[PDB]
């Protein structure tokens, strides 16, 4: 995916509720540093719904592709109130940005 395009999506659509840097603040949603390769619901210091705590999957390209298409369908009960991203390419780009920015 295209990291530049993903950055723009993140800033426009996600930053309202999320940070990505190491040690960054929780907002409505959790800080996302360290996301890849970790189970759902594991950002230190954030109180998740039971649903996000218990989904029991590992975040990686394939699972983020599905989640970001329709968050509520993937994690019923989630408190992330955000419209799914329909376009596959946009999800790919966003995920490439996340994979970089959440792993500095
Ligand atoms: C506020 C209105 C949000 C917007 C906009 C986005 N997200 Fe979000 N996210 C939000 C909350 C409140 C939560 C926790 C939900 C819960 O039920 O406890 C989340 C969670 C995520 C996760 C899961 C994190 C985990 O550690 O399992 C991811 C991967 C995530 N959010 C990503 C994300 C992206 C990339 C967004 C823009 C497309 C985005 N979120 C928007 C709140 C909000």
PDB file of C-alpha atoms and ligand atoms in Angstrom:
ATOM      1  CA  UNK A   1       0.000   0.000   0.000  1.00  0.00           C
ATOM      2  CA  UNK A   2       0.875   3.693  -0.406  1.00  0.00           C
ATOM      3  CA  UNK A   3       2.026   5.110   2.901  1.00  0.00           C
ATOM      4  CA  UNK A   4       1.489   8.742   1.805  1.00  0.00           C
ATOM      5  CA  UNK A   5      -2.134   8.099   0.917  1.00  0.00           C
ATOM      6  CA  UNK A   6      -2.586   6.188   4.151  1.00  0.00           C
ATOM      7  CA  UNK A   7      -1.202   9.054   6.171  1.00  0.00           C
ATOM      8  CA  UNK A   8      -3.809  11.395   4.651  1.00  0.00           C
ATOM      9  CA  UNK A   9      -6.626   8.959   5.477  1.00  0.00           C
ATOM     10  CA  UNK A  10      -5.379   8.524   9.022  1.00  0.00           C
ATOM     11  CA  UNK A  11      -5.064  12.261   9.642  1.00  0.00           C
ATOM     12  CA  UNK A  12      -8.475  13.035   8.122  1.00  0.00           C
ATOM     13  CA  UNK A  13     -10.472  10.052   9.499  1.00  0.00           C
ATOM     14  CA  UNK A  14      -8.691   8.541  12.528  1.00  0.00           C
ATOM     15  CA  UNK A  15      -6.524  11.130  14.368  1.00  0.00           C
ATOM     16  CA  UNK A  16      -9.656  12.614  15.959  1.00  0.00           C
ATOM     17  CA  UNK A  17      -9.713   9.526  18.218  1.00  0.00           C
ATOM     18  CA  UNK A  18      -6.179   8.004  17.958  1.00  0.00           C
ATOM     19  CA  UNK A  19      -2.489   8.659  18.261  1.00  0.00           C
ATOM     20  CA  UNK A  20       0.226   6.422  16.784  1.00  0.00           C
ATOM     21  CA  UNK A  21       3.548   7.436  18.385  1.00  0.00           C
ATOM     22  CA  UNK A  22       5.300   5.605  21.206  1.00  0.00           C
ATOM     23  CA  UNK A  23       3.938   6.873  24.534  1.00  0.00           C
ATOM     24  CA  UNK A  24       1.209   8.874  22.750  1.00  0.00           C
ATOM     25  CA  UNK A  25      -1.949   9.840  24.559  1.00  0.00           C
ATOM     26  CA  UNK A  26      -5.207   7.924  24.663  1.00  0.00           C
ATOM     27  CA  UNK A  27      -8.116   9.953  23.252  1.00  0.00           C
ATOM     28  CA  UNK A  28     -11.615   8.573  22.675  1.00  0.00           C
ATOM     29  CA  UNK A  29      -9.701   5.590  21.307  1.00  0.00           C
ATOM     30  CA  UNK A  30      -6.450   3.967  22.341  1.00  0.00           C
ATOM     31  CA  UNK A  31      -2.966   4.871  21.266  1.00  0.00           C
ATOM     32  CA  UNK A  32      -2.042   2.475  18.447  1.00  0.00           C
ATOM     33  CA  UNK A  33       1.743   2.141  18.856  1.00  0.00           C
ATOM     34  CA  UNK A  34       2.753  -1.505  18.803  1.00  0.00           C
ATOM     35  CA  UNK A  35      -0.545  -2.640  17.214  1.00  0.00           C
ATOM     36  CA  UNK A  36       0.803  -5.123  14.642  1.00  0.00           C
ATOM     37  CA  UNK A  37       1.337  -8.660  15.827  1.00  0.00           C
ATOM     38  CA  UNK A  38      -0.536  -8.079  19.055  1.00  0.00           C
ATOM     39  CA  UNK A  39      -3.944  -9.335  20.131  1.00  0.00           C
ATOM     40  CA  UNK A  40      -6.980  -7.060  20.181  1.00  0.00           C
ATOM     41  CA  UNK A  41      -7.476  -4.963  23.295  1.00  0.00           C
ATOM     42  CA  UNK A  42      -3.883  -4.670  24.490  1.00  0.00           C
ATOM     43  CA  UNK A  43      -2.829  -0.986  24.434  1.00  0.00           C
ATOM     44  CA  UNK A  44      -1.464  -0.286  27.957  1.00  0.00           C
ATOM     45  CA  UNK A  45      -3.650   1.973  30.059  1.00  0.00           C
ATOM     46  CA  UNK A  46      -6.813   1.995  27.868  1.00  0.00           C
ATOM     47  CA  UNK A  47     -10.089   0.502  29.134  1.00  0.00           C
ATOM     48  CA  UNK A  48     -11.711  -1.395  26.255  1.00  0.00           C
ATOM     49  CA  UNK A  49     -15.139  -2.854  25.863  1.00  0.00           C
ATOM     50  CA  UNK A  50     -15.349  -6.535  26.668  1.00  0.00           C
ATOM     51  CA  UNK A  51     -15.967  -7.030  22.967  1.00  0.00           C
ATOM     52  CA  UNK A  52     -12.669  -5.446  21.891  1.00  0.00           C
ATOM     53  CA  UNK A  53     -10.878  -7.121  24.825  1.00  0.00           C
ATOM     54  CA  UNK A  54     -12.207 -10.562  23.922  1.00  0.00           C
ATOM     55  CA  UNK A  55     -12.270 -10.628  20.098  1.00  0.00           C
ATOM     56  CA  UNK A  56      -9.190 -12.848  20.291  1.00  0.00           C
ATOM     57  CA  UNK A  57      -7.485 -12.137  17.006  1.00  0.00           C
ATOM     58  CA  UNK A  58      -4.072 -10.766  16.123  1.00  0.00           C
ATOM     59  CA  UNK A  59      -3.848  -7.436  14.320  1.00  0.00           C
ATOM     60  CA  UNK A  60      -2.084  -7.764  10.975  1.00  0.00           C
ATOM     61  CA  UNK A  61      -2.873  -6.762   7.396  1.00  0.00           C
ATOM     62  CA  UNK A  62      -5.584  -9.415   6.853  1.00  0.00           C
ATOM     63  CA  UNK A  63      -7.526  -8.737  10.067  1.00  0.00           C
ATOM     64  CA  UNK A  64      -7.237  -4.967   9.788  1.00  0.00           C
ATOM     65  CA  UNK A  65      -8.496  -5.173   6.200  1.00  0.00           C
ATOM     66  CA  UNK A  66     -11.688  -6.788   7.458  1.00  0.00           C
ATOM     67  CA  UNK A  67     -12.108  -4.706  10.622  1.00  0.00           C
ATOM     68  CA  UNK A  68     -11.694  -1.391   8.847  1.00  0.00           C
ATOM     69  CA  UNK A  69     -14.318  -2.344   6.228  1.00  0.00           C
ATOM     70  CA  UNK A  70     -16.954  -2.493   8.953  1.00  0.00           C
ATOM     71  CA  UNK A  71     -15.782  -2.099  12.570  1.00  0.00           C
ATOM     72  CA  UNK A  72     -19.135  -2.824  14.236  1.00  0.00           C
ATOM     73  CA  UNK A  73     -19.647  -6.030  12.233  1.00  0.00           C
ATOM     74  CA  UNK A  74     -16.203  -7.370  13.153  1.00  0.00           C
ATOM     75  CA  UNK A  75     -16.452  -6.369  16.850  1.00  0.00           C
ATOM     76  CA  UNK A  76     -20.136  -6.223  17.852  1.00  0.00           C
ATOM     77  CA  UNK A  77     -20.426  -4.060  20.915  1.00  0.00           C
ATOM     78  CA  UNK A  78     -17.418  -1.922  20.054  1.00  0.00           C
ATOM     79  CA  UNK A  79     -17.360   1.686  21.262  1.00  0.00           C
ATOM     80  CA  UNK A  80     -15.451   2.691  18.100  1.00  0.00           C
ATOM     81  CA  UNK A  81     -18.224   4.572  16.294  1.00  0.00           C
ATOM     82  CA  UNK A  82     -16.783   4.917  12.809  1.00  0.00           C
ATOM     83  CA  UNK A  83     -18.120   4.181   9.356  1.00  0.00           C
ATOM     84  CA  UNK A  84     -16.441   1.375   7.466  1.00  0.00           C
ATOM     85  CA  UNK A  85     -14.087   2.196   4.582  1.00  0.00           C
ATOM     86  CA  UNK A  86     -15.523   0.509   1.477  1.00  0.00           C
ATOM     87  CA  UNK A  87     -12.651   0.828  -0.879  1.00  0.00           C
ATOM     88  CA  UNK A  88     -10.046  -1.915  -0.741  1.00  0.00           C
ATOM     89  CA  UNK A  89      -7.236   0.287  -1.992  1.00  0.00           C
ATOM     90  CA  UNK A  90      -7.918   2.920   0.688  1.00  0.00           C
ATOM     91  CA  UNK A  91      -7.802   0.228   3.390  1.00  0.00           C
ATOM     92  CA  UNK A  92      -4.540  -1.103   1.970  1.00  0.00           C
ATOM     93  CA  UNK A  93      -2.977   2.378   1.945  1.00  0.00           C
ATOM     94  CA  UNK A  94      -4.146   3.210   5.460  1.00  0.00           C
ATOM     95  CA  UNK A  95      -2.832  -0.122   6.762  1.00  0.00           C
ATOM     96  CA  UNK A  96       0.600   0.477   5.128  1.00  0.00           C
ATOM     97  CA  UNK A  97       0.748   3.845   6.939  1.00  0.00           C
ATOM     98  CA  UNK A  98      -0.248   2.239  10.230  1.00  0.00           C
ATOM     99  CA  UNK A  99       2.358  -0.515   9.805  1.00  0.00           C
ATOM    100  CA  UNK A 100       5.064   2.145   9.536  1.00  0.00           C
ATOM    101  CA  UNK A 101       3.868   4.762  11.977  1.00  0.00           C
ATOM    102  CA  UNK A 102       2.890   2.417  14.811  1.00  0.00           C
ATOM    103  CA  UNK A 103       6.333   0.721  14.709  1.00  0.00           C
ATOM    104  CA  UNK A 104       8.790   3.589  14.966  1.00  0.00           C
TER     105      UNK A 104
HETATM  106  C1  LIG B   1     -13.614   7.990  17.534  1.00  0.00           C
HETATM  107  C2  LIG B   1     -14.901   8.578  17.047  1.00  0.00           C
HETATM  108  C3  LIG B   1     -12.962   6.963  16.655  1.00  0.00           C
HETATM  109  C4  LIG B   1     -12.611   7.051  15.333  1.00  0.00           C
HETATM  110  C5  LIG B   1     -12.894   8.218  14.404  1.00  0.00           C
HETATM  111  C6  LIG B   1     -11.801   5.911  15.038  1.00  0.00           C
HETATM  112  N1  LIG B   1     -11.685   5.084  16.134  1.00  0.00           N
HETATM  113 FE1  LIG B   1     -10.597   3.466  16.232  1.00  0.00          FE
HETATM  114  N2  LIG B   1     -11.230   3.141  18.132  1.00  0.00           N
HETATM  115  C7  LIG B   1     -12.061   3.996  18.874  1.00  0.00           C
HETATM  116  C8  LIG B   1     -12.369   3.419  20.155  1.00  0.00           C
HETATM  117  C9  LIG B   1     -13.277   4.066  21.194  1.00  0.00           C
HETATM  118  C10 LIG B   1     -11.765   2.212  20.227  1.00  0.00           C
HETATM  119  C11 LIG B   1     -11.897   1.185  21.326  1.00  0.00           C
HETATM  120  C12 LIG B   1     -13.182   0.396  21.083  1.00  0.00           C
HETATM  121  C13 LIG B   1     -13.618  -0.546  22.163  1.00  0.00           C
HETATM  122  O1  LIG B   1     -14.679  -1.251  21.904  1.00  0.00           O
HETATM  123  O2  LIG B   1     -13.035  -0.640  23.251  1.00  0.00           O
HETATM  124  C14 LIG B   1     -11.076   2.026  18.940  1.00  0.00           C
HETATM  125  C15 LIG B   1     -10.328   0.904  18.608  1.00  0.00           C
HETATM  126  C16 LIG B   1      -9.616   0.781  17.417  1.00  0.00           C
HETATM  127  C17 LIG B   1      -8.768  -0.346  17.093  1.00  0.00           C
HETATM  128  C18 LIG B   1      -8.560  -1.556  17.959  1.00  0.00           C
HETATM  129  C19 LIG B   1      -7.389  -1.312  18.928  1.00  0.00           C
HETATM  130  C20 LIG B   1      -6.969  -2.510  19.770  1.00  0.00           C
HETATM  131  O3  LIG B   1      -6.021  -2.309  20.569  1.00  0.00           O
HETATM  132  O4  LIG B   1      -7.559  -3.637  19.604  1.00  0.00           O
HETATM  133  C21 LIG B   1      -8.157  -0.055  15.917  1.00  0.00           C
HETATM  134  C22 LIG B   1      -7.185  -0.904  15.121  1.00  0.00           C
HETATM  135  C23 LIG B   1      -8.621   1.251  15.506  1.00  0.00           C
HETATM  136  N3  LIG B   1      -9.529   1.755  16.434  1.00  0.00           N
HETATM  137  C24 LIG B   1      -8.256   1.893  14.352  1.00  0.00           C
HETATM  138  C25 LIG B   1      -8.813   3.068  13.843  1.00  0.00           C
HETATM  139  C26 LIG B   1      -8.509   3.656  12.583  1.00  0.00           C
HETATM  140  C27 LIG B   1      -7.327   3.185  11.734  1.00  0.00           C
HETATM  141  C28 LIG B   1      -9.363   4.677  12.365  1.00  0.00           C
HETATM  142  C29 LIG B   1      -9.572   5.500  11.159  1.00  0.00           C
HETATM  143  C30 LIG B   1      -9.958   4.763   9.961  1.00  0.00           C
HETATM  144  C31 LIG B   1     -10.193   4.748  13.578  1.00  0.00           C
HETATM  145  N4  LIG B   1      -9.823   3.736  14.394  1.00  0.00           N
HETATM  146  C32 LIG B   1     -11.150   5.709  13.819  1.00  0.00           C
HETATM  147  C33 LIG B   1     -12.525   5.221  18.408  1.00  0.00           C
HETATM  148  C34 LIG B   1     -12.375   5.723  17.144  1.00  0.00           C
END
